[PDB]
Amino acid sequence: EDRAAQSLLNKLIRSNLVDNTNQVEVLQRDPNSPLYSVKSFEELRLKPQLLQGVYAMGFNRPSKIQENALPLMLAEPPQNLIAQSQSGTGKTAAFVLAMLSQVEPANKYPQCLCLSPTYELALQTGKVIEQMGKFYPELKLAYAVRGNKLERGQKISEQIVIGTPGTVLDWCSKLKFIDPKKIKVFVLDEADVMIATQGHQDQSIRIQRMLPRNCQMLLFSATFEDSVWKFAQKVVPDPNVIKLKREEETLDTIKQYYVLCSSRDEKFQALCNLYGAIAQAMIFCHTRKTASWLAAELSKEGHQVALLSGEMMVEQRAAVIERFREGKEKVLVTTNVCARGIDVEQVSVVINFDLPVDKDGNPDNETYLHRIGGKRGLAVNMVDSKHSMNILNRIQEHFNKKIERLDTDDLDEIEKIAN
Ligand SMILES: Nc1ncnc2c1ncn2[C@@H]1O[C@H](COP(=O)(O)OP(=O)(O)NP(=O)(O)O)[C@@H](O)[C@H]1O
Ligand SMILES: [Mg+2]
């Protein structure tokens, strides 16, 4: 639920590319045509002011996905593209670079159009445009979003437009703010998020149908879900397709344990004995009340922990995650919802204060694999009722790797796991 907020949070805390060891699968529209992949930005002959912006942003080498996407997007005649790769692989930097290659800042009208699922996500993309194109003196950016106060009769002179589908459609047709036949590059970013809203699909297609045939069409998604793929086929005609499989999570270098408990207050005491061993840790709870209650009790017992709860704005969650990464916080308590799909790094211990279960009540094996884990990690699961023990064993059955019973009372066994 709310993929747009999860996506926004990952943007705010993302500091570098995610390392992927898989290979890029390329499906060109012409299977006879060769596969051209570059390994440096000089190989692309970018405009000097654009290469300057690329280097000024700390980029020195194309990312894995960019090695194939950049030469394909800069080829003549323009090639359309549907690209799929996990968050943090450089999809956004890729199409920003493509947009900045085709824009002529002397022509004071929109030439590149990008659709974002939300205003906040549009702002994140606009920041990348502002950075990479900061050596384009006359280059200006317009935000076609609901909050924009624009009186009729004006014709926007910004060369790049980022916006949400509803407002962009109004600007291109009804309100006559954009002439769509002058658009040279069209991007639909975060298609996996965009489809979460019913109206967005129809609006995005209607916008695309107004563009000229010589306009380059680009679509990017974090996931390869069939619904996104079917939507993408309706948006991008005659597409090349690029895919980078998500980096697998092995689970083999992590010691798993579970603690039988009589009640909740037992789980708190059992957690206290463990805390001595540690080595930042994340603690996952089902309800905000559990997370708030647990975070408070840990403070009373002499330890400061960061809390991740739903009343916090996305910007506050990012600030807490950043402090946790910088070591200022040694332990982070979070609900399942606030942590679902968030790429938190620098975690070596996971405490499943509550076992991850889907809305069907069954085990959430996907969430379990994502939280845990080639560096040694530790996973402690807190069982309470017999139901929870029935669940835990189903997890143990799923992965077929044993979760040894930890005896929280015995401090000697706690040192054994710490090894
Ligand atoms: N060629 C590059 N070299 C180094 N860092 C890069 C490069 N391209 C992008 N990055 C960085 O890698 C991170 C992810 O880049 P970004 O373009 O936002 O990825 P993404 O695939 O669009 N993410 P998402 O929109 O959440 O699916 C950011 O910190 C970028 O600054
Ligand atoms: Mg992206």
Numbering used by the authors: 54 to 331, 334 to 428, 434 to 479
Could you pull the original sentences from the published paper?
At the cytoplasmic face of the NPC, Nxf1•Nxt1-bound mRNPs encounter the cytoplasmic filament nucleoporins Gle1, Nup42, and Nup214, which specifically activate the DEAD-box helicase DDX19 to remove Nxf1•Nxt1 from the mRNP8. Gle1CTD plays an important organizational role by providing spatially separated binding sites for Nup42GBM and the DEAD-box helicase DDX19/scDbp5. A comprehensive structure-function analysis of DDX19 indicates that binding of Gle1CTD•Nup42GBM induces a conformational change in DDX19, thereby stimulating its ATPase activity.
Therefore, we used a construct of DDX19 that contained the N-terminal auto-inhibitory helix but did not contain the flexible N-terminal extension (DDX19∆N53, residues 54–479). The inhibited state does not differ structurally in the presence of ADP or ATP, as the nucleotide-binding pocket readily accommodates the additional phosphate and Mg2+ ion, with minor changes in the sidechain conformations of K64 from the auto-inhibitory helix and E243 in the nucleotide binding pocket. To gain further insight into how Gle1CTD•Nup42GBM binding facilitates DDX19 activation, we compared the structures of Gle1CTD•Nup42GBM•DDX19∆N53 to those of apo DDX19∆N53. The most apparent difference was a rotation of both DDX19NTD and the auto-inhibitory helix away from DDX19CTD, despite the auto-inhibitory helix still being bound between the two domains.
